[PDB]
Write a protein that binds this ligand. Structure first.
Ligand SMILES: [Zn+2]
Lengths: 93, 191, 497, 286, 48, 287
């Protein structure tokens, strides 16, 4: 998911892993012991709140969209910061 | 006296570990280093002589110096196992000759080839015309077993210099049992 | 701007020619304003066609006096293509030199007592140039000099550049007198007897260059041959200065060439020599390859004097250019070289001389604010006297606080600015602001206060301003007082000159 | 091992002035010398250095040599005059190291247990703090290849102590100092921001260019994991990031409230006292 | 400030007491923590 | 014989070795040697500076090691430029860097061998940043007692060198000695990069890192110092509200003001760091 929006629900894990609702505790918390996620579990609605993530692979056409996520950060900082000192360029001299 | 810097090249190729030269080529070329370092000592005091390993990776363990003591120490336990490499063996000593502080010393290299080489004739003629542009005079003495009456090396020395240039001389081991001192007896009297 | 100015001016002298009463002061105004080479040849050809003699005498001398040398070269070029010898006499200005010589020898009013009180001081520092340059001023053009007779042991104290200036004053006091100036100096001639004083023989040709400035004669080539002879670089110091100063404004060609092969002799003190010489010969020419070679030689050279000589050199080549020079002024000011920035200061000064435009004061005053080098900042605030000299009254008001600055360099150059700008006026405000300047603890700011205070009082007697005799007695006082600094007291005897 | 190194302006100039030494005679290759380090702790410091004549053939691009007698007796010279100084490695002007630079460190590993090589830059252009630092280490690989040496990058910082501060701090004579609070932080917002834009831009340009040309490979010893680390955080709301928004708004509350407080205090004092001394000076003199 | 902060270290400064003055223009003064000195004018304030 | 105004062209590498060799010996005075070339009388240049080893005899004419000079000049011969020696220098970290009796005792030897041999002294102590400090000395010829002792001509650099007049005990050496002028020649490219090298302090380490480290902390524990700044708000401004009432009692200014001015305006300049760098989050978080 683009997310985050890192908070999941019990229905998502129990339907995907096709395991009972009592064993999803052992499921997600063992992954906390593996080290792939540090997240916490909200047991009122039985939701699961993930934190960070464990990077594994990725793919082609991802270096392109990576340049899109980058160049957008490029024109963001360029525009706004060039607007900042555009105001105060006069008073400097 | 004559001004020049002589760079001696020992042959570390795996074919140089045999005892055909009595008692062993290790001590035979050691005496060869003994006679070239003592002759250049009796020639000019300003001559500085280092050593270079031609086979496998080329590394000079003894920086160019007139004292041969550290060179004599590297002659022992040299571990001369490897495949002979020619084209780089001359140029590695050429770079050591470009590090000389004084520029009045002529560039001179002496090397020993005791092993059959895979170097193509195009590579040695490119080094020949390169040494023609760089003026370097190299005097090679062929030891060990190789092609009978070495040609590509003889043509290498021939095409290396000309007019005169007095000069590059090649001494090939004769096809017969002899001591290493008898092989180096000719070059020490006349190049 | 000069765009529509001369276009309105050119028709007004034509309506004066169509007017019944001819008046030469209006064509005199356009001669010094419109300043075009063909117009003076047109109006004077109409004077020769009119057979005018008596009343053309005015406008003809206004042409010699108030117009450029190339303006004289242009009018003589189209004219010569009684009155034929008259135009030679009026354009050469020899009669003006002879009457000036007779005016100076007959009417000379001097006082030797002050020169003797400065003589017997005999201070070994900085006094070498002091007395000789001061009495060379007051006595200019007399040719009667008794100085080496009245002061002797003081001149025997001379060493190094002292004998340069000593024989250089020989030319300052002999200024004018174009004829006998060469042969009358035979005793003081630039020997070149080789117990080497050689700055001596360099200053001798310097003296011959001070007299031969503006117009001249074969003596220019006489110094040129001696530049190609004798020794080096000691001859080039005052000799090439003589070669360039005599050709000043004449747009001489060969001097630019033989000074390039002379520039390549690779020495230091001769740097200012060829720099000022090449800058004087190219004055007003706004050439291309001259500045290109001067800016091309400044790299491989290790000397800062060749940088300063070429600084004023490329500054002097451009005079009255206004916005035409700003293309180069932008490059000289934007550069990080302080000497080249100071070069652009003298360049923008001579280009904006006479104009009060605020385009110059933009960058000129900007580098006078934000720059970290006090010397070029000093030359920046000195240009106020060059460009604003037409309106001296406002300078004491705008530079009022600018003489209160912490560094003495700004207080100095500003004191020189107020001195040279208001010099032609009797304004008491400049003298009021210069009163605390001579009270400043720093030495050379008092010195510049002494020189500038003598510049405001020029020809002005006690009835003009009350501070005349007060400063006159203050000059002899500080120079006769050993406790005061030698630097600050140098401008005292200088002020007396 | 070696974490960070402190490169003083003295050692950098000691390479660059030798770039004038052999640069006036030229021509190609680079300026190589022996680096004199000072190790007080895990953080490395550099004080002095010395340069040795060096030439490298291209033929034979792997051939390199240095003068050991120069390294020996001059170390005996510099250790004599200063007992605290010793060689921590070597250096070169790059700009980018050729593959042959490894064996130089392997030869001088007999002098020092760990020799850190410092790439430098004689002509400042881009992108930031000059030079570079590489430490000699054997990382093997996750692919279990026979152990090879790929030098790990050591972060380099510029510093000084006392006298080295005196020289350069007077030598600036260029820009205002600092000035604290006004121009300082905002120019850093331009430099660190914009140089961060073109950094990753050209670096992501190399990311795609290496995939387009240069394979093998470079994809993926680290490509797959590093690029996923880029995909770790997109990172936008909902939800808690919306809470951080107006919480940050609640953070600017106090400071701008204090701002209005200083406005009232500064305006009160200055305006009242100035008008007092103003009206008094006018009514008394006039 | 820096100039007087430069002036005052290479020397220091103290306060004396004149016990006599000299015909040579010198003055008899003590360095009070130590033995006495005898110094001379000091051209601003005269002997009288 | 002929004397003219002198100028010392120095290289930044020379000044670096100067203060570096002087800082490593503090407090103890060290002994170096000056290296360069004599172009003429009125101009001189020092293109290199090397340090002599410290010995037991202390600072003395015998402290110069001849075999060190022979091997150094040999090491300079294999170095790119083997220029000839010129003069000597010794640091004085512990005092006002004035020439002692041993300094002139080695000066007649350096003037014997070398014609000029300008003596230079340098100290770190005087100024930490904004002064040239260092020093300059040249021994006047005692054989000149016949002629006058007061050259030079072109007094520009001379009269400007004398100022401050350098105390008393230093200008007490102005008899029998005289200083010499020093200017910094460019070499602008290296001077500009080394300028930015120390600017890494107040600007940023990489010109990126340190104020991206200001993006690391970034209000973080930086509000703790804002809490101490707002404690300086309460502290300083609770006695600042007592000031204007007292001004009405004493009628009025006691000159004064207490200052007790500016201050937290700079804290609001850190609030400009707050608004700017946090406004970067909209650029950081989104794409
Ligand atoms: Zn001492």
């Amino acid at each position: 998911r683009p997310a985050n929006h890192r908070q999941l629900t019990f229905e998502e894990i129990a339907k995907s892993a096709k395991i009972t609702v009592n064993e999803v505790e052992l499921l997600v918390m063992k992954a906390l012991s593996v080290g792939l996620v540090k997240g916490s579990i909200d047991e009122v609605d039985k939701r699961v709140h993930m934190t960070w993530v464990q990077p594994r692979v990725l793919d082609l056409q991802q270096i392109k969209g990576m340049k899109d996520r980058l160049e957008f950060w490029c024109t963001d900082v360029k525009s706004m910061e060039m607007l900042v000192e555009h105001q105060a360029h006069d008073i400097l001299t | 006296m004559v001004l020049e810097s002589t760079m001696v090249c020992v042959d570390n190729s795996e074919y140089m570990r045999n005892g055909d030269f009595l008692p062993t080529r290790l001590q035979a070329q050691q005496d060869a280093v003994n006679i070239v370092c003592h002759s250049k000592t009796r020639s000019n005091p300003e001559n500085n002589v280092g050593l270079i390993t031609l086979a496998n990776d080329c590394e000079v363990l003894t920086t160019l110096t007139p004292d041969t003591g550290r060179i004599l120490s590297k002659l022992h336990t040299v571990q001369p196992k490897g495949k002979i490499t020619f084209c780089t063996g001359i140029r590695v000593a050429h770079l050591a000759l470009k590090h000389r502080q004084g520029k009045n010393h002529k560039m001179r290299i002496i090397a020993f080839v005791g092993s059959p080489v895979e170097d193509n004739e195009k590579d040695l003629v490119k080094l020949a015309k390169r040494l023609k542009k760089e003026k370097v005079n190299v005097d090679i003495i062929n030891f060990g077993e190789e092609e009978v009456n070495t040609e590509k090396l003889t043509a290498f020395v021939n095409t290396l210099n000309g007019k005169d240039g007095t000069g590059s001389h090649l001494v090939t081991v004769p096809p017969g049992p002899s001591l290493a001192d008898a092989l180096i007896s000719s070059p020490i009297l006349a190049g | 701007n000069k765009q529509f100015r001369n276009k309105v001016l050119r028709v007004l002298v034509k309506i004066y020619m169509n007017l019944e009463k001819p008046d030469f002061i209006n064509v005199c105004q356009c001669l010094i304003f419109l300043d075009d080479p063909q117009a003076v040849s047109d109006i004077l050809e109409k004077l020769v066609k009119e057979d005018n003699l008596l009343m053309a005498y005015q406008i003809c001398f206004d042409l010699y006096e108030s117009a450029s040398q190339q303006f004289l070269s242009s009018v003589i070029q189209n004219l010569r293509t009684d009155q034929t010898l008259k135009m030679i006499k009026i354009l050469s200005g020899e009669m003006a030199i002879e009457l000036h010589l007779q005016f100076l020898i007959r009417n000379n009013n001097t006082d030797l007592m002050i020169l003797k009180n400065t003589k017997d001081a005999v201070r070994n520092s900085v006094c070498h140039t002091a007395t000789v340059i001061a009495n060379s001023f007051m006595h200019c053009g007399t040719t009667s000099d008794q100085f080496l007779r009245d002061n002797l042991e003081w001149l025997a104290r001379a060493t190094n550049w002292a004998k340069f200036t000593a024989t250089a004053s020989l030319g300052v006091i002999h200024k004018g007198h174009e004829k006998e100036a060469l042969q009358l100096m035979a005793t003081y001639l630039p020997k070149d007897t080789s117990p080497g004083s050689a700055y001596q023989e360099g200053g001798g040709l310097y003296a011959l260059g001070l007299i031969h400035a503006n117009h001249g004669g074969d003596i220019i080539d006489y110094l040129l041959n001696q530049l190609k002879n004798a020794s080096n670089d000691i001859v080039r110091h005052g000799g090439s200065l003589g070669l360039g100063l005599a050709a000043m404004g004449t747009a001489r060609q060969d001097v630019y060439d033989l000074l390039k092969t002379n520039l390549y002799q690779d020495d230091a003190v001769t740097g200012e020599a060829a720099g000022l010489a090449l800058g004087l010969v190219m004055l007003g020419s706004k050439n291309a390859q001259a500045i290109e070679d001067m800016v091309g030689y400044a790299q491989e050279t290790q000397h800062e004097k060749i940088l300063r000589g070429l600084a004023v050199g490329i500054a002097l080549v451009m005079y009255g250019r206004m916005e035409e020079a700003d293309a180069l002024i932008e490059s000289l000011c934007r550069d990080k070289d302080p000497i080249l920035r100071r070069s652009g200061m003298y360049t923008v000064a001579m280009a904006y001389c006479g104009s009060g435009n605020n385009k110059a004061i933009r960058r000129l005053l900007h580098v006078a604010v934000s720059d970290v080098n006090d010397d070029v900042r000093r030359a920046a605030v000195e240009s106020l006297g060059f460009i604003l000299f037409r309106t001296p009254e406002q300078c004491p008001s705008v530079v009022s606080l600018l003489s209160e600055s912490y560094n003495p360099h700004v207080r100095y150059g500003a004191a020189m600015a107020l001195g040279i700008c208001c010099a032609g006026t009797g304004n008491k405000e400049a003298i009021n602001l210069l009163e605390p300047m001579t009270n400043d603890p720093v030495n050379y700011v008092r010195q510049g206060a002494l020189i500038a205070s003598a510049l405001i009082m020029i020809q002005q007697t006690e009835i003009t301003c009350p501070k005349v005799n007060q400063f006159r007695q203050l000059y002899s006082k500080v120079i006769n007082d050993k406790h005061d600094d030698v630097m600050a007291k140098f401008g005292a005897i200088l002020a007396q000159g | 091992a070696v974490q960070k190194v402190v490169v003083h302006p003295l050692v950098l100039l000691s390479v660059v002035d030798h770039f004038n030494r052999i640069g006036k005679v030229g021509n190609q290759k680079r300026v190589v010398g022996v680096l004199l380090g000072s190790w007080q702790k895990k953080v490395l410091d550099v004080s002095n250095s010395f340069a040795v004549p060096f030439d490298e053939d291209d033929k034979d691009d792997s051939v390199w040599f240095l003068d050991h007698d120069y390294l020996e007796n001059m170390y005996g010279m510099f250790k004599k005059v200063n007992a605290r100084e010793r060689i921590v490695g070597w250096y070169h002007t790059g700009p980018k190291l050729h593959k042959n630079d490894i064996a130089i460190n392997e030869l001088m590993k007999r002098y020092c247990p760990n020799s850190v090589l410092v790439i430098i830059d004689v002509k400042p252009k881009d992108l930031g703090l000059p030079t570079e630092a590489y430490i000699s280490v054997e990382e093997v690989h996750d692919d279990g290849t026979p152990t090879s040496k790929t030098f790990e990058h050591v972060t380099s910082e510029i510093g000084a102590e006392e006298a080295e501060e005196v020289g350069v701090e007077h030598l600036l004579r260029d820009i205002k100092d600092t000035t604290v609070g006004t121009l300082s932080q905002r120019i850093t917002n331009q430099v660190h921001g914009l140089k961060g834009l073109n950094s990753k831009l050209l670096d992501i340009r190399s990311y795609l260019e290496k995939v387009a040309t240069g394979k093998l490979p470079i994809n993926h010893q680290i490509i797959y994991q590093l690029q996923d680390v880029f995909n770790l955080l997109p990172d936008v709301s909902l939800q808690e990031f919306v809470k951080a928004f107006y919480l940050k708004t609640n953070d600017q509350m106090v400071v701008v409230y204090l701002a209005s407080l200083i406005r009232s205090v500064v305006a009160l004092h200055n305006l009242i006292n100035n008008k007092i001394a103003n009206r008094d000076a006018e009514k008394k003199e006039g | 400030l820096r100039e007087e902060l430069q002036l005052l270290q290479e020397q220091g400064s103290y306060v004396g007491e004149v016990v006599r003055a000299m015909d040579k223009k010198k003055v008899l003064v003590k360095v009070h923590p130590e033995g006495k000195f005898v110094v001379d004018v000091d051209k601003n304030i005269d002997i009288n | 014989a002929v004397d003219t105004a002198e100028q010392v062209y120095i290289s930044s590498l020379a000044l670096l070795k100067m203060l570096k060799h002087g800082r490593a010996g503090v407090p103890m005075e060290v002994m170096g040697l000056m290296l360069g070339e004599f172009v003429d009388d009125y101009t001189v240049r020092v293109i290199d500076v090397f340090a002599m080893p410290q010995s037991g005899t202390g600072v003395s004419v015998e402290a110069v090691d001849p075999v060190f000079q022979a091997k150094m000049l040999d090491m300079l011969k294999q170095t790119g430029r083997p220029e000839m020696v010129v003069g000597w220098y010794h640091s004085h970290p512990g005092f006002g860097c004035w020439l002692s009796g041993v300094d002139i005792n080695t000066q007649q030897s350096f003037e014997a061998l070398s014609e000029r041999a300008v003596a230079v002294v340098v100290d770190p102590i005087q100024s930490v940043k904004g002064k040239v400090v260092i020093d300059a000395f040249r021994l006047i010829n005692a054989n000149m007692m016949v002629l006058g002792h007061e050259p030079r001509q072109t007094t520009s650099n001379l009269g400007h060198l004398n100022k401050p007049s350098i105390q008393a005990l230093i200008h007490g050496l102005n008899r029998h000695y005289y200083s010499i002028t020093i200017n910094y020649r460019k070499n602008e490219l290296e001077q500009k990069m080394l300028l930015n090298l120390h600017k890494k302090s107040w600007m940023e380490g990489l010109t990126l890192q340190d104020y991206s480290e200001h993006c690391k902390h970034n209000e973080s524990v930086v509000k703790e110092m804002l809490e101490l700044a707002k404690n300086y708000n309460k502290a300083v401004e609770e006695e600042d509200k007592m000031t204007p009432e007292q001004l009405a009692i004493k009628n009025v200014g006691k000159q004064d003001p207490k200052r007790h001015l500016e201050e937290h305006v700079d804290v609001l300049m850190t609030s400009n760091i707050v608004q700017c760098l946090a406004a970067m989050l909209d650029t950081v978080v989104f794409k």
